[PDB]
Amino acid sequence: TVSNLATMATVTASGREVSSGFGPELAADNQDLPDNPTDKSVHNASGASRWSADRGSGPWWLAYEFPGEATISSVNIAWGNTYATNYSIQTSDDGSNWTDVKTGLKATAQAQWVKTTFDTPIKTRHIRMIATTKSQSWSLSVWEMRTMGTISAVATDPLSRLTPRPLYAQSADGEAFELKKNTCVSVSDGSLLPAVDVMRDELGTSYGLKLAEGTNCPITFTLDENLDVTGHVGSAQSITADEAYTIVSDADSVTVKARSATAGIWAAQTLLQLIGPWTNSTVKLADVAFIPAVNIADAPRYQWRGVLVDPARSFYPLDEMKQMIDVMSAYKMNTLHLHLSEDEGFRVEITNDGRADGDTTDYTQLAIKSGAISYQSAWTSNWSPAQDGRTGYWTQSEFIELVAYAADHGIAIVPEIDGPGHSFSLLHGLAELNTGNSNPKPAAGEDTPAFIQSAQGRSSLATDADITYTVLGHIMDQLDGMIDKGIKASTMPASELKRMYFHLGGDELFLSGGAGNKTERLQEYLGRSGALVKERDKTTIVWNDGLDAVDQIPEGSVVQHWTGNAANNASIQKLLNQRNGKIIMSPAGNTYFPQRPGTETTGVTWACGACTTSNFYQWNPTSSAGTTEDKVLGVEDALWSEHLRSLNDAEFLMYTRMMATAEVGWTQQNRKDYDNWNKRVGDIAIDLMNRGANFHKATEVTSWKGSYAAVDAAEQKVTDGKVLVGRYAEPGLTGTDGLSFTATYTAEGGAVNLPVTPDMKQTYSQQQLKNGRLVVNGAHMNSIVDVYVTLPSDVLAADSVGRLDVSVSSSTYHHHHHH
Ligand SMILES: CC(=O)N[C@H]1/C(=N/OC(=O)Nc2ccccc2)O[C@H](COS(=O)(=O)O)[C@@H](O)[C@@H]1O
Ligand SMILES: CC(=O)N[C@H]1/C(=N/OC(=O)Nc2ccccc2)O[C@H](COS(=O)(=O)O)[C@@H](O)[C@@H]1O
Ligand SMILES: [Ca+2]
């Protein structure tokens, strides 16, 4: 049973003819047309039950806000003596961002009912008529907009942004918690200060929040090694309680309990999402930050939630690695897998300190010789950038700082030194490694083999030579030492952050050719290498295509699955079922970021054609592995850098598909919903534009939205009356002309239109090609719009009195802001 929901709506319009009568609300009073409605004396009676709109260029719009979720079957509009000749009906969840539901609507006569039926009733909190053209110069006339449907009295859910989707979250009773400049934070333990620093690094710049450590503060962080959220874990659900946290907030207090220092950071990242997608603003905003009153109990399905980053094909400087860590942490990723060595590079300094007795190998040449090679454009005849890979390596100091920064964001480092294949950087770097059955051999009297095309995919370390395992052993110790120095500096506990795993690789031995005995090479190498890991009290990881050595690697070893169907992989099932192993899932088609993110893009096509956010979201790692939940550690995205030459171009591939993997890592199988996730991307995107992080503007995402934030104008330089008062964030702007910015000045003395200057440093571009080859940084997101007004002179030097009125209008966005 439907009804005209107009009578309980809060009505807004683009404007109105006269302040006296003909107000927008008179479209919403559910009154049947009067007798002789076309008569000037009926239509223009001072009390006629119709909206008379503003004049000017338009567009003219009439918007209803419903006290709840409306289910609308149809919209019936009784047009007056001036009718819309072109108009649309749009919905909004937030009241600022409008989506077309029906376009190409026309009235064709005065006092005419035009009925728009939805083939499926639409659920929304807002509906609006927007008209571009009308039948006369007279104000547009609406006797009635009847919105026929049912209302459900459900409030807006301020928990609706949280990604990943938490285990339990509900609104709590009362007003939200207001953050003031002096709001301090109390911690039960010093290992929770990294959680508070994460909040401080964002809220410091954005809202001017010091968040000083204090005693008896209204925001508390309590470490509780027994914190129990299993009350919220259904029979069909599964968690890793070590990363469990609860948040209970109200108008006076925010109470965080965390099972670990790691979960403290998770709790912090949830609070930052709740505050909103402007917390990473680079300018102090004018609006106050709120934490809504909520009740959260959260923990991740999977304990292993990672990204493989490959600097080996193309180096990433430390500052870029930090920028990836920030966004990994923001989505509660807890593992940074460093593929440090390849056929085309070694990316970390290894010194000659603390070698075994008898070991005179010069390890300094590894970085010196193989840090100065990279992926070669010329050895591709495709779309790959004209530029070779970035050369270089992290010094020991930088790598330690890399570890400390990861740790302070709750992310552990897992090193990979890939062998016995994908090992050419090791043979090119160390003369001593060129011995035994190593492939290829150096040329006559050359102590290292040449970096030439013929080496790629044919590398093998000497699986039969002692020196291979001596050198491997020394690299593991140096990595070990630098990671321990990294964690120490972090103040995070070694007991959470020191990941006792070493990744040996074992993938694609001799995929392009080589010297034969592929299986014998694998079994010997991963056997002996496996023992190096076991003796260092670590668990071995190998790629699934290395499980020729399934019997040789230690009991309880881990496979990282990436190629084929793990569920029907005999060697995977034997390791899981016969050798108490475990699995990390990185099936290419769901986790490999170089797989092109869309059919409009240029990139790798073999896994799916385009592996979209659907391919990254819509899979069950445990079912895909064909094993039981207990035997699945979790997941890893893979950033392989054959074709990657900048952070910007990496971020294009990483985002927002990484936020899908984060949800696969963390959220319960039965709380997964792709459409629900898809809806949350718009705010994810607003936060990314604030971070200055790039992302693919994927066509399957339907939640691309705009957002306005007032700037704290008192912190801004006035230059010639001109000052930054606002910022507008929307993915995909090729310019600002589609937006109309207006501002008015008034003091407590003297109404005056101020000149607005919208300033967007950069426009949105998709991938650009030159001579068939990807241009580096071709694909980039438009900037956030800096909204400047020019104040008059009389008001350039008037102390603050001056409240400002800023309006932003597009076909798909409207906001009026006031402070
Ligand atoms: C404020 C108002 O009522 N404006 C309406 C209007 N203005 O015209 C007059 O009121 N003028 C007038 C006419 C007769 C005697 C004395 C004065 O006319 C607009 C056009 O309406 S229509 O001809 O019926 O199409 C109307 O849209 C304005 O709201
Ligand atoms: C563990 C891993 O992924 N190894 C390499 C890799 N695997 O090779 C393939 O992708 N195989 C393949 C390629 C084309 C046709 C048929 C099979 O791929 C990584 C690159 O990933 S991708 O660009 O998304 O393909 C590579 O960097 C790894 O060394
Ligand atoms: Ca009416």
CA atoms within 13 A on the CB side of 784: 28
Question: Token pair 């959470």 is at which residue?
Answer: 496
18 CB less than 6 Å from ligand 1?
A: yes
Residue 109: Cβ-neighbour burial (10 angstroms; 0-12, 13-18, 19+): exposed
Q: How far is CA 142 from CA 31, 60, 98, 664, 814, in A?
A: 12, 11, 21, 49, 21
Residue 87 is inside which H or E element, if any? Answer: strand 84-92
Pull the structure tokens for residue 304. Answer: 């292993």
Q: What is the DSSP letter of 719?
A: B
Amino acid at 610: A
Residues labelled as active-site residues: 508
* Closest residue by CA, ligand 1 atom 7: 44
DSSP string, 90-124: EEESSSSB-EEEEEEE---STTEEEEEEEEEEEEE
Q: Is the CB of 543 under 6 A from ligand 2?
A: yes
Q: Apex CA 641: angle with CA 636 and CA 646, to 5°? A: 110
The closest residue, in CA terms, to atom 3 on ligand 2 is 562
Residue 125 tokens, joined: 């909190």
Side chain identity at 235, as an amino acid letter? S
Q: Is 640 in the pocket of ligand 2 (CB under 6 A)?
A: yes
- Strands annotated E in 624-764: 632-639, 707-710, 722-729, 740-746, 752-754, 756-759
Q: Report the separation in Å between the CA atom of 114 and the middle of ligand 3, taken as the mean of its atom positions.
A: 15
DSSP-assigned letter for residue 254: E
User: Does 274 show up as a binding residue in the annotation?
Assistant: no
Q: How far is Cα 181 from Cα 189, in angstroms, rounded to an integer?
A: 23
State the greatest distance between any 2 C-alpha atoms of the chain, in Å, as a whole number.
108
Going from the N-terminus, what domains does the chain have, and what CATH number goes with each?
Answer: 3-152 (2.60.120.260), 168-298 (3.30.379.10), 304-691 (3.20.20.80)
Pairing of strands 304-309, 632-639: parallel
**Amino acid in the structure at residue 276:** G
Looking from the CA of residue 18, the nearest atom of ligand 1 is 1
* 163 Cα: distance to centroid of ligand 2 (angstroms): 29
The ligand whose atoms approach the alpha carbon of 603 most closely is 2
Nearest CA to ligand 1 atom 24: 40
Determine the Cα–Cα distance for residues 410 and 423; give it in Å rounded to an integer: 30
3 state SS of 617: helix
Q: How far is the CA of 81 from the centre of ligand 1 (A)?
A: 10
Residue entry with tokens 């459409």: 675
Residue 26 annotated in ligand binding: yes
* Residue of 508, 547, 602, 644 best suited for mutating to test ligand 2, as the one with most atoms within 8 Å of CB: 508
- What is the H or E stretch that residue 677 is in? helix 674-679
| Structure letter (DSSP) for residue 593 | T
CB-based contact 302:633 (threshold 8 Å): yes
Q: Which residues are CB-neighbours of 483 under 8 A, at least 6 positions away? A: 403, 413, 415, 498
143 a known binding residue? yes
Q: How far apart are CA 761 and CA 784, in angstroms?
A: 8
Output the six-digit token pair for 134: 């009308």
Per DSSP (E only), the strands in 501-615 are 501-505, 539-543, 558-561, 582-585
In three-state secondary structure terms, 214 is: coil
Distance 77 CA to ligand 3 centre (A): 10
Dihedral sign for Cα 146, 148, 151, 155, please.
negative
Among 340, 459, 606, 639, say which to mutate for ligand 2: greatest number of ligand atoms within 8 Å of CB: 606
Q: What is the resolution of this structure in A?
A: 2.2
Stretch (H or E) spanning 482 = helix 466-490
Count CB neighbours of 768 within 10 A. 13
Reduced to 3 states (helix: H, G, I; strand: E, B; else coil), residue 584 is strand
Pairing mode, if any, of strands 141-152 and 84-92?
unpaired
CA-closest candidate to residue 780, choices 704, 688, 703: 688
φ/ψ (deg, to 5) at 61: -135, 150
Q: What is the spatial distance between Cα 663 and Cα 72, in angstroms, rounded to a whole number?
A: 32
The amino acid occupying position 269 is Q
Residue 814 C-alpha to ligand 1 middle, in angstroms? Answer: 30
138 lines ligand 1 (CB under 6 A): yes
Quote the tokens at residue 200.
């401080």
Taking alpha carbons only, the member of 227, 290, 287, 226 closest to residue 256 is 227
- Which residue puts its alpha carbon closest to atom 19 of ligand 2? 640
